[PDB]
Amino acid sequence: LKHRVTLRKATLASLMQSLSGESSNRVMWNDRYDTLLIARDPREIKNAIEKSVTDFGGLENYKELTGGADPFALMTPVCGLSANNIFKLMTEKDVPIDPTSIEYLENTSFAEHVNTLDSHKNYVVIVNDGRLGHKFLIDLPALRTAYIIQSDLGGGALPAVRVEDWISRRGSDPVSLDELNQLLSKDFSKMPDDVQTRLLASILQIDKDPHKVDIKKLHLDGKLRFASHEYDFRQFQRNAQYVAGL
């Protein structure tokens, strides 16, 4: 009810904070999507890393052959990795959900779809925006309000932004369902450059700074795909609480 926004804010806040812990981080950003997220075992995951490193003839050679990264290091997830895993955390109860395997809509408008969603359920939408080259989540708490959840290593039209920072700065900053419709519509790709820029910084840049966005890097013939999924707010809290509790 009326307490939803505040609790939601608190859940995300504690979840994010926990992500500086080794086990919380390992469990949160693992890339195995066909098993339950809360079923992930940090020790099991760490053994796999140790095994992989043993395969490459020791840690120093592993790094030398994989780009220099430390496989044991905490992770800063790419946008696909953060969208998929937070989608799982929000939607799962006792049956694994694989965001890479679920069905996506691709010839309907966001407006269209949302206007068909039970206003008394919560939904979260995973967006695969091939125009931006970006996956992110639209959270739609029960009632209308939408919120964005994302990370980005940068390189495209949008600046790099850590999920923690996006969440801490704009986690509970609601966005226009109308601007969302415009963004997530077939005809966005054929919109006037300044409008494209307008929507992008608005919805997806922490300071809403248009000067930090570069639409040249848009892929104008890219495909748009999204999938919504109902969720139970308490279950999401439970899931978040488990991870944060590691």
From Swiss-Prot:
Changing residue 100 to A: Impaired ability to mediate deamidation of host NEDD8, leading to decreased ability to inhibit the host cell cycle. Keywords: Host nucleus, Hydrolase, Secreted, Toxin, Virulence. The active site is at 79, 134, 150. Its main location: secreted. The keyword Secreted applies. It comes from the Bacteria. Protein-glutamine deamidase effector that inhibits the host cell cycle and other key cellular processes such as the actin network and programmed-cell death. Acts by mediating the side chain deamidation of 'Gln-40' of host NEDD8, converting it to glutamate, thereby abolishing the activity of cullin-RING-based E3 ubiquitin-protein ligase complexes (CRL complexes). Inactivation of CRL complexes prevents ubiquitination and subsequent degradation of the cyclin-dependent kinase inhibitors CDKN1A/p21 and CDKN1B/p27, leading to G1 and G2 cell cycle arrests in host cells. Belongs to the Cif family. This is Protein-glutamine deamidase Cif. The gene is cif.
